[PDB]
Symmetry: D2
Subunit: 237 residues, 4 copies
């Protein structure tokens, strides 16, 4: 199995597998069963922003999800990532729909990782930023249903040519380069990610969610990971 750490924007409460009884954001460490969650007043049809951060000194993975003038939902979790992840990883975005559906539309995404070693200059750095997506994003590994559209958006899950979301979809986008997310001689390892997103749905209870995740480099969509497993895990353990 892969090794996964994620920030989930989970629109659909799957209380049979431990979700709280509301839409929520969560921090996931090697399980769909979040280690920490917060209530999320998700707003269909409005552009949201997520900002995720972590550093190895603080050892606190945090996320905030906002809609302008609209709400600010925050979650954090204390964890030593170096003890969980391999030292080389790929970073990505995932999304699913199930019986119920929603767009999982990414409008922009940025990511920064640093390793520091007793200088004002980083010992290692990686940064990428997209404020739109090309028709042929050569620096993305697209998995499952994920595609880019004529508007420059990344559609993680399937949408029809009219823009309507489809059920039973899974898709992911990984940055092409492996990231050296920790190294045993570094003094500090830190990372930050931001993305903006648009979730539209006609459904009473839109589903299922989208995530930013960090994984082993050769990560692939697990078999059986549609709907409530957000394209990340093979089961609900």
């Amino acid at each position: 199995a892969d090794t996964i750490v994620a920030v989930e924007l989970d629109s659909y409460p799957n209380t049979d597998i431990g979700d709280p009884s509301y839409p929520h954001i969560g921090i996931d460490i090697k399980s769909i069963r979040s280690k920490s969650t917060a209530r999320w007043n998700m707003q269909t049809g409005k552009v949201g922003t997520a900002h995720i951060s972590y550093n190895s000194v603080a050892k606190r993975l945090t996320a905030v999800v906002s809609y302008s003038g609209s709400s600010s939902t925050t979650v954090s979790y204390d964890v030593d990532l170096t003890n969980v992840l391999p030292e080389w990883v790929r970073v990505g975005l995932s999304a699913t729909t199930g019986l119920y559906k929603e767009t999982n539309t990414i409008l922009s995404w940025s990511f920064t990782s640093k390793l520091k070693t007793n200088s004002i200059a980083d010992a290692n750095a990686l940064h990428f930023s997209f404020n739109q997506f090309t028709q042929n994003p050569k620096d993305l590994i697209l998995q499952g249903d994920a595609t880019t559209d004529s508007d420059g958006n990344l559609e993680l899950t399937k949408v029809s040519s009219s823009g309507s979301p489809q059920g039973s979809s899974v898709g992911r986008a990984l940055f092409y380069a492996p990231v050296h997310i920790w190294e045993s001689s570094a003094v500090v390892a830190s990372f930050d990610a931001t993305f903006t997103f648009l979730i539209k749905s006609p459904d009473s209870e839109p589903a299922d969610g989208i995530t930013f995740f960090i994984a082993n480099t050769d990560t692939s969509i697990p078999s059986g990971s549609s709907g409530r497993l957000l394209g990340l895990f093979p089961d609900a353990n």
Copy 2:
């Protein structure tokens, strides 16, 4: 009185005013009496590095102080900085000697502050980096005894022309521009600082310490802030 938040590298245990009984690093919020400390195996005559970070989501101010191959001392403290500091601040370095003495030599210093508001692009940013100091550092406000030397170092406290440290010294260096360190509409406010330093001393128990601090914009060295008060506070309350 000024309003001060600091990371102290405190070489001299002043147990009468609450220091632990060893050299230590500490996080100071409006008092010399640190809110959190860690033991510090300080090494005279070796170049050290300090890395300080905070973000408004995590609400955890952290520092790590290292000497290569030598030791890694870390301290953190959970606090909401926006509720403590004014929204405009100056950032700086301070140092003192007292009866006992040490160089408080800064070899490099960098600082980054960001404000983010629902885009992959910062809503506001400030960054500065010095890997050496000019003879006339026009972007620094030098206070007290602080000066730059012919080697490109910032000598926060007095040193003789042979390089020997002097007692009863206080000095500070502030970045010239005010920094907008938080703002009530921002989704996230974050800052990072790094500096490298050299503390030499002939004394059995070198004193007194050096700090990175954040203050009201018009901050000045308090009267009576030499030695154990590290140039930051007018008393030990």
Copy 3:
């Protein structure tokens, strides 16, 4: 007199003092009489963007001014800036109106300066970015008529409470910190600036222009610098 290098967005052709006979962008080195100009299809009432760059190896100061889908005007000039400017400068924006008028509204501004010396890490850096302006921009030196408005814009020249531009106005905004724009031991010195702007006017021939400029640190608006002298020069020599 001050020492000035500027990029001018010159809406009004003052052919008596050497302007071409059209609105134009220009590179100005110690004179209002541009060293290089390009025709500018300026569009009142639309948001424009300017990007300015220079590096000491290439020795080519360049600017591009764009309106989305609208036009792209570019100018460059080969010059060794280190031989013209003092090693410490302030950077700023200036604007004027004269008999004829226009808003000189700045919506965002960023600036980066680097000094490099045989490492992958900069020897010195300064960066600032504003994507809006506070009511009390403590890190700006406002000169003349320049003010910030309730919308978060910087109004370099006077506008009425209805937003109508006024004639015979001059204003400038400088970044608070001096910038070490070159240093004799650096291998490379480089700088980049971006701003976005909005020029509205009811006038047949809107006037007079706005600039990004670099000057001696103590620069002030010259006497007699309204209208065609864009707040930068005391005469048209």
Copy 4:
């Protein structure tokens, strides 16, 4: 054939194929026959630094190669890179030896590419920085003889376990991710690279050189590209 743009640090004058009669730096556009060269006072056994820059407004590709206190060699060339390179590229370092030999040791490498579109925020960015190299650099495509060593250096050409350079060697290292180096709607495209290097040799006339290059994404070492062709070209046309 591949499509190549390079900055060459050419230690060995191959005057039969157009080199000047001295060690030199050069800018290469689709040929080994440099479009522009400068004399280079190369210093065996000393660490050097190269800084390379380009932007689409200025249209001037420049390089400077320095040894501290030692010499500063600069070359530039006016060219519109968007008309030469594909819009997606890989970036890399190459080196060769031939009959005569030298180490082609890279100690650090950084690279930044930006695309800007009428905001203070980049429309697209990629940055990477290595201040040393891992034993298994998962974000590098190593070609030919290139390897990383136990000291954290990248040895582009073969060296023995005692550190002695070998003849008839070719090697390259490419960054794993493709780079979107230009795009037809961008207002500006810019890139910067820095690396530090160490060239040791016992030979009277050390050979052959090392380069930073930009190529089509699927670039490979051409057959017959050892020695004077610096691993980049299949012939001397």
